[PDB]
Amino acid sequence: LRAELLDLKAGGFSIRNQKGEQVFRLAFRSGALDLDSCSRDGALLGCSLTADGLPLHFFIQTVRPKDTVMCYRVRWEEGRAVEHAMFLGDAAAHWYGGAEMRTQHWPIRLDGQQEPQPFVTSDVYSSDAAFGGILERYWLSSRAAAIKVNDSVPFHLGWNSTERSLRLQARYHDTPYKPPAPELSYRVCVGSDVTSIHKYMVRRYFNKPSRVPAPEAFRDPIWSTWALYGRAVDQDKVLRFAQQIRLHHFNSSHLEIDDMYTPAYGDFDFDEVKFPNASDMFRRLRDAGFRVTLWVHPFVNYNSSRFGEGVERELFVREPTGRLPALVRWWNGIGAVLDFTHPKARDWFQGHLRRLRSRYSVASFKFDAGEVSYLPRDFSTYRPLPDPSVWSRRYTEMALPFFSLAEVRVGYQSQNISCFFRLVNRDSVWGYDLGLRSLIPAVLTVSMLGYPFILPDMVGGNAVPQRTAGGDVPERELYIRWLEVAAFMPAMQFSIPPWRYDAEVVAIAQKFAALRASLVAPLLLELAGEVTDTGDPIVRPLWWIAPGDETAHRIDSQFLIGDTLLVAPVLEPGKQERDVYLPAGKWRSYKGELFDKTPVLLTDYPVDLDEIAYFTWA
Amino acid sequence: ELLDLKAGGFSIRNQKGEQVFRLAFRSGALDLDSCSRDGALLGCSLTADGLPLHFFIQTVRPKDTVMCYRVRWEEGRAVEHAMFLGDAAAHWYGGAEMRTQHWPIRLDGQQEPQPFVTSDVYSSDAAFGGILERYWLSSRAAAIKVNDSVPFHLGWNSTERSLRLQARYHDTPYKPPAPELSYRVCVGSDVTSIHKYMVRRYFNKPSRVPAPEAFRDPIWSTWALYGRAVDQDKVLRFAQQIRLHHFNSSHLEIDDMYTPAYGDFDFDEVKFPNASDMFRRLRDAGFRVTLWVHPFVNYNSSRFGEGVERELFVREPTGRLPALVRWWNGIGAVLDFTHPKARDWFQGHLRRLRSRYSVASFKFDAGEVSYLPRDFSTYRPLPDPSVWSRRYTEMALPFFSLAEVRVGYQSQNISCFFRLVNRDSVWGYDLGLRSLIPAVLTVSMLGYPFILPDMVGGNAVPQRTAGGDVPERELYIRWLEVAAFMPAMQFSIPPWRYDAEVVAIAQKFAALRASLVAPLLLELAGEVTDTGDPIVRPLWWIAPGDETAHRIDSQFLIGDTLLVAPVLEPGKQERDVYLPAGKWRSYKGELFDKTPVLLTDYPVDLDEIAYFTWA
Ligand SMILES: *[C@@H]1O[C@H](CO)[C@@H](O[C@@H]2O[C@H](CO)[C@@H](O)[C@H](O)[C@H]2NC(C)=O)[C@H](O)[C@H]1NC(C)=O
Ligand SMILES: *[C@@H]1O[C@H](CO)[C@@H](O[C@@H]2O[C@H](CO)[C@@H](O)[C@H](O)[C@H]2NC(C)=O)[C@H](O)[C@H]1NC(C)=O
Ligand SMILES: *[C@@H]1O[C@H](CO)[C@@H](O[C@@H]2O[C@H](CO)[C@@H](O)[C@H](O)[C@H]2NC(C)=O)[C@H](O)[C@H]1NC(C)=O
Ligand SMILES: OC[C@H]1O[C@H](O[C@H]2[C@H](O)[C@@H](O)[C@H](O)O[C@@H]2CO)[C@H](O)[C@@H](O)[C@H]1O
Ligand SMILES: OC[C@H]1O[C@H](O[C@H]2[C@H](O)[C@@H](O)[C@H](O)O[C@@H]2CO)[C@H](O)[C@@H](O)[C@H]1O
Ligand SMILES: *[C@@H]1O[C@H](CO)[C@@H](O)[C@H](O)[C@H]1NC(C)=O
Ligand SMILES: *[C@@H]1O[C@H](CO)[C@@H](O)[C@H](O)[C@H]1NC(C)=O
Ligand SMILES: *[C@@H]1O[C@H](CO)[C@@H](O)[C@H](O)[C@H]1NC(C)=O
Ligand SMILES: *[C@@H]1O[C@H](CO)[C@@H](O)[C@H](O)[C@H]1NC(C)=O
Ligand SMILES: *[C@@H]1O[C@H](CO)[C@@H](O)[C@H](O)[C@H]1NC(C)=O
User: Fold this and answer.
1) Prior bond to B177 cis, omega within 30?
2) Are B220 and B234 in contact (CB under 8 A)?
3) d(Cα B225, Cα B126) in Å, to the nearest integer?
4) Which chain A residue shows the shortest CA-CA distance from B330?
């Protein structure tokens, strides 16, 4: 059976574009159709029975929303689980989108075998199976086809590398999804090029942020206490850090005071031991020209002076019967988690944040955690969440009153929250496993999902022992190369500072701060103001401007800021040159060279330790 | 044998030809053409709808006078069989402690099968109480034991007078280690013989006897008298007042609340400034002391953190974190008595209280799985959740001599006292005066000889009290009188709360208990170890062929030789008394030797109980 350019068989379907290329192929894996049960009424193709003879609500509806776009609405509705296997295709077909992951490849590459698991916001820092804090049920092909899985679906995702398939599953057994009868539905749209079809899908499904964060956050470096000091942060260390930033002649968007400044997790005011005179600390920081943000989280531990208050006022996520709080474990221990569906728990959280601003003139907050992997398997909330990841959304709404200098590390339809979105903890390693090579794939993936204001975590990574190339801190060359690429991303955050290394590392950092300020920042601010209208990302893949270009489809070592700044950092140790691809148009190099014969690969393009290759539209 | 199997159910007859058991299949019907016989085994492979089935009936003749029928129905589809109680002449005993306790068993209205698990029935007429067994006995000398394997749920239907026996795994605290309903129906010559066979087969006997003074001297509890507000001064004033009114004491039981928070084991220094001195004074005044304990650690307990970190608590289903519970004293965790570490932790605190304060033993309160979460996990798995109650009652074993528990799930071989759940200060069968004999008989039937019928006069809860503030004078006296003849006797609201006559009546019944009742209780207690027979016996125990003895809920036996007939109604100075076969000497000296007989309008004044001794 043919529905426009879609071939339906018993065991699956395939779709072609007008050129006659196969741009989508899908197998039914929880059963087969009985084609004799299928009838066509206009654009609608419905089927009533499976091949085994079970009743079924299946349909394919053809929709022509534009002259150059054909969409296919698909529904398979049976307690029997639904699975369709979406084939990525041959080596020339490259896919983008889905979730932030621990090992982030661009284009998407998933190794081995994974049985479908809940497609929900998880902390992937320790897990290569899980799906990260920022995700969307959206996959885009370099062959100008895209799939959006319906928000209704109790959606689980697996993969099979042998047949290079995504396993799309709807199920209600062994999952944190509740019903408001499994149901897998989605829309496949086919366009003329990858950029056009992407823009159609983004405008249809994702909201835009309508505001821009503080302009200094797109220019001056952010300074975090976390990687430098860890939990042992205190009043003296914060002031010594602030002083050292000024003496080494660096600007600051703000200083972010991290874990731990409270006596217990759940308390909001300062530990009087480690911060004897917080008021004085903030007065000195204000006088020295530092805005300040504070690390906050949705947890109240059992030994918090606020745990009792939360239980009695019922501000916590509950066990399934909805009567008592449910205990959770996070990286800082055991307690409850605040229910952001509950107006009282929202007012309670907000009240403590407004008190910290009122008292200490704190500008905004680092909103840490927010993943449903830190909620119990099965739970209840003041308002029901059949889709559990909507809890992540509700937590990110806590940033709205302080959006201007706020960061969150989760996004579930959080795109219209006009704050920064931080990548989960990068490790001080070179590789794609949360390392230097993960940065461009991860930022591109997040940008694709409609989150323009991206903070790529910490320059040099978090320097976790056993996860650090160089033992104690990231090795010198890793720090420099990271610093360089980080200078061209929308927000830039140091923790382990340049003066931990040597005068040359400091000099390189000062150079990239100055270059960021004069070249990058004016363009970031223009593009940030443009988001409100266009909904286009700030960090763009090479294929954005060269959508018909197979090399631009594959590249993970280069990116664009808007359409006009092309960046090609060195991402390998012991290299003073790299290959640079210029995809289309005329490009002026940082040294003044005019390249007007494109597309072209520049072979062995010189880039010394203290340099990055960048090119501007001509 | 004498079992007729049809498609829709079966019936069983005794050798006299009476129908002693009738059961309907309610989750399907048998295809009789699928049934074949190999010796005593009758197996069937398909239902009437044509579904595959593991069904069998095996005939077993274990004794000359006993025929048993092993039945299995094994299908995720729930199994339900409806057991018919029969006509008005058929009377049934056993099952669970209930809020409204009738004898024989009477269940009103309609109840969908619900989990047959240890619950706190104080506020609930549907639920099954802390002491229960899947065991039902007929006055027609038939009994059923439901297999321990069954994920067993019980309902009832008063219209057809049926028990609804259900096996299901959906919406229940039962986990599997495929629903399965199996049971054994045994038929004997008389109700007492068949009961003794079933008890010896299924229930263990306690091999030890509690402290002899617990069967003689009254127990004194602070609970109904003082409530939570109990203090060091109040405990000492109570102890003094017991001595000044010339009463003996087995021991004084200090109840809720003596700790700063629930989960702490040592004394609140505010309400008990010098606990050591309090216990020294009580010891000098000749008082043994027991302490109220429970399996909960509240979130505001200084011990909650320790329990979380050492993982001593019942967990949520994934078995990683503690699960919070609500009980009558707030929100916290519950200790996992499947966990050796949590058992050692609990025991350690109890041994410290004995070592420090010379406390004799403990009141082990709660223990029902209705205070555990719907779905939970434990160090060792409990596919049958009520085994948690068993594991909690094992905490009494080292202090059994003066211990009480209020739950029993195969806890019979734990040689401590078993307390009825809170009696209310009312006359009726809803935890009132009329509930006492049915409840004690029901518990005795399940192989628990050492029974404590809670508090003389009840707990005096406002809105659940005949007389407002305390139980009305006549209720207190009648309760006191029947309580004097039960295996253990516990006052809380004391006689001197009322008047000199109530005190005098209490002193009389204390003296009578000491000289008549206590020597017999101790003999029968020592006999349990060998016979496994209860102390408190129904009239039908000695008169098993007697239809009147089958029905009576207002009389009981201590052993075979002491017959008790208390007044259980306000404004009555007489009652009808039934004497079964044999010769009886009344408390006034009258020889009744023309029996069985109904004594009509037998005089019993306010300060008296009717009792008779074998002659
Ligand atoms: C992953 O995909 C491969 C290829 O589709 C699956 O392997 C096939 O399995 C079927 C049985 O259903 C065999 O008859 C085929 O011969 C297999 N083909 C190959 C190339 O191995 C495999 O089953 C899938 N794995 C999972 C976990 O679903
Ligand atoms: C911001 O984005 C959120 C999330 O998509 C929008 O919230 C949805 O709004 C519609 C219309 O009111 C509701 O029916 C949905 O239930 C909302 N979803 C959630 C998860 O809250 C919100 O309206 C957006 N606001 C703007 C102005 O863009
Ligand atoms: C006391 O009673 C308990 C419970 O009936 C007995 O424990 C059982 O012992 C059997 C056989 O050794 C085990 O297979 C069961 O697992 C135990 N059941 C439970 C629920 O714990 C115990 O053995 C009895 N002890 C004595 C001496 O009578
Ligand atoms: O503790 C402060 C720290 O928290 C977050 O990182 C933690 C992460 O969420 C865990 O998965 C990991 O095991 O532990 C990390 C801390 O050691 C946060 O992302 C980080 O920036 C910092 O705020
Ligand atoms: O509070 C001590 C008290 O506890 C027990 O009785 C409680 C019962 O378990 C609850 O169901 C009821 O709602 O509240 C009762 C206390 O008010 C116990 O049985 C009793 O003897 C005493 O120890
Ligand atoms: C997607 O979900 C919406 C809301 O549940 C529903 O109306 C629509 O029909 C679904 N689409 C398909 C193709 O099943
Ligand atoms: C530092 O801040 C000052 C004041 O806003 C500004 O004029 C200057 O351009 C900034 N320099 C850099 C390198 O960011
Ligand atoms: C009762 O349960 C036991 C243990 O699971 C089993 O072996 C036995 O056969 C069952 N009895 C019947 C009658 O099904
Ligand atoms: C109770 O039994 C009657 C008569 O046998 C029957 O008609 C009725 O449906 C039963 N009720 C329930 C709730 O099963
Ligand atoms: C009370 O206890 C005393 C001292 O042990 C004992 O001699 C007496 O027989 C007991 N009397 C009663 C009525 O319990």
Assistant:
1) no
2) no
3) 30
4) A312
Closest Cα of chain A to B75: distance in Å? 20
Q: What 3-state DSSP class applies to A358?
A: helix
Nearest chain B CA: its distance from A266 CA (Å): 15
DSSP B541: G
Q: Give residue for tokens 């474990």.
A: A329
Token representation of residue B127: 């639920």
Taking the C-alpha atoms of residue B113 and residue B98, their distance in angstroms, rounded to an integer, is 15
Q: Rounded to whole angstroms, how far apart are CA atoms A49 and A47?
A: 6
Q: What does R_g of chain B's alpha carbons equal in angstroms?
A: 25
Cβ pair A528, A212 in contact under 8 A: yes
Least Cα distance to A15 among A27, A24, A26 occurs for A24
Tell me which residue has tokens 């959740």. Answer: B385
Contacts of B588 (CB under 8 A, 6+ apart): none
Alpha-carbon span B442 to B445, nearest angstrom: 5
Which ligand places an atom closest to the C-alpha of A169?
A: 1
Any ligand 5 atom below 6 A from CB of B292: yes
From the CA of B382, the nearest ligand is 3
Separation CA A174–CA A410 (nearest Å): 24
Q: CA-CA distance, A372 to A124, in Å (whole number)?
A: 12
Give me the residue from A320, A327, A378 closest to B324, CB to CB: A327
Report, in angstroms and rounded to the nearest whole number, the Rg of chain A calculated over CA atoms. Answer: 25
Which of these, A325, A268, A332, lies nearest to A301 by C-alpha position?
Answer: A332
B465 touches B424 (CB < 8 A)? yes
Contacts of A20 (CB under 8 A, 6+ apart): none
Distance CA B184, CA B197 (A): 12
CA angle B568, B571, B574 (to 5 degrees): 65
B270 with B308: CB under 8 angstroms? no
- With CB atoms and an 8 Å threshold, state whether B321 touches A327: yes
Q: What is d(CA A157, CA A83) in angstroms, rounded to the nearest whole number? A: 9
Residue listed under structure tokens 């000098």: B284
Q: Do the strands A420-422 and A364-367 form a parallel or antiparallel pair, or are they unpaired? A: unpaired
Q: Whose CA is nearest to atom 3 of ligand 2?
A: A413
- For helices B232-244 and B275-284, what crossing angle results, to 10°? 10
> Kind of pairing, strands A222-224 and A113-118?
unpaired
Output the six-digit token pair for B307.
């329990």
Q: Mark yes or no for CB contact A323/B326 under 8 Å.
A: yes
The residues near B357 (Cβ < 8 Å, ≥ 6 apart) are B275, B276, B279, B289
How many CB atoms lie under 10 A from the CB of residue B176?
9
d(CA B16, CA B142): 13
DSSP label at residue A103: B
What's phi and psi for A167, nearest 5 deg?
Answer: -95, 100
B330 touches chain A (CB under 8 A): no
Give the C-alpha separation, A337 to A330, whole Å.
Answer: 10
Closest by Cα among A246, A241, A248, A236 to A225 = A241
Ligand 6 pocket, A185 CB below 6 A?
A: yes
Sheet of B404-405: strand order equals B451-452, B417-419, B404-405, B361-364, B289-293, B252-254, B219-221, B490-491
A356 sits in which H/E element: helix A343-360
Reduce the DSSP state of residue B382 to 3 states and report it. coil
* Cβ of residue B110 lying under 6 Å from some atom of ligand 9: yes
Place of tokens 């197979």: A550
User: Do A324 and B326 lie within an 8 Å CB cutoff?
Assistant: yes
